[PDB]
Symmetry: C3
């Protein structure tokens, strides 16, 4: 799995345990081993949400399986609570695109799944 986020907040405002806590949450919610979980946060970005440059973010959570309509609502509740808690960004100022990948479209270790 990959969780990638773009935000306008400052890097110094991302806690030291952000990558670990996010890696843990992503693996636990998608039921994937932590060794396959990648987390990325791009901070200090020029980003406007709803016409304001106040703290906001948008990102994507992609994974081969574990993601589908009948599950994204729960995924969202947990991820938004987590991000609001760690970065302090309001839940109505964040978007997350959930993507269910096909193994054949994902390269890893020089091969595909």
């Amino acid at each position: 799995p990959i969780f990638t986020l773009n935000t306008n907040i400052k890097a110094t405002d991302v806690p030291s345990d952000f990558l670990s806590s996010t890696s843990a949450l992503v693996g636990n919610i998608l039921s994937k081993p932590g060794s396959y979980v990648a987390v990325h946060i791009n901070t200090d970005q020029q980003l406007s949400f709803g016409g304001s440059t106040n703290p906001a973010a948008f990102g994507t959570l992609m994974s081969i399986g574990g993601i589908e309509p009948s599950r994204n609502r729960d995924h969202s509740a947990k991820l938004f609570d987590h991000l609001n808690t760690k970065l302090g960004i309001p839940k109505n100022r964040m978007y997350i695109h959930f993507v269910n990948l096909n193994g054949d479209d994902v390269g890893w270790n020089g091969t595909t799944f």
Copy 2:
């Protein structure tokens, strides 16, 4: 909707009204309220187009379209003019991936559409 752009131009060359003006523009072409519009630009990126590192950019415009047409050609013309007039970037050196999102795959305010 979300409009995110990556480009190799300097951050200083981006107009201070870019975000506000791009946000209003996006809400217009997609006929979506500004309250749901997010705009993001990542500048100073190491980006080569056609083998040269001259001014160029690539991005995505995502929105939940549902039971509606495409209009990507009209969107691209209106968007490229905007980006070209505002950033001065050559239109033949910019790609824009148009993505029609399914509400169930989009997380917002701790829930999904």
Copy 3:
């Protein structure tokens, strides 16, 4: 085509010819002219793989044609070999999402393809 990659390695650690050789390679594997190839690398990113911030990366390769289930494993072997050589990043610490694009949803110049 567009090959965009995010990595935690330092910007100066990216060889001056990375964009050049990568552009040539992408064009080669997809049988596409270099003039339509865009390569992007976002370095110095806060990114973990398996919870570790040791060298790692993830990216996307998108193209209107050339990307298909029957072709991506060969693309992967070639791209991972190239990235591991150029960037020194272990192959089991990189992900590449292969995306085949429809010309109808790709903006260039001022219209689509």
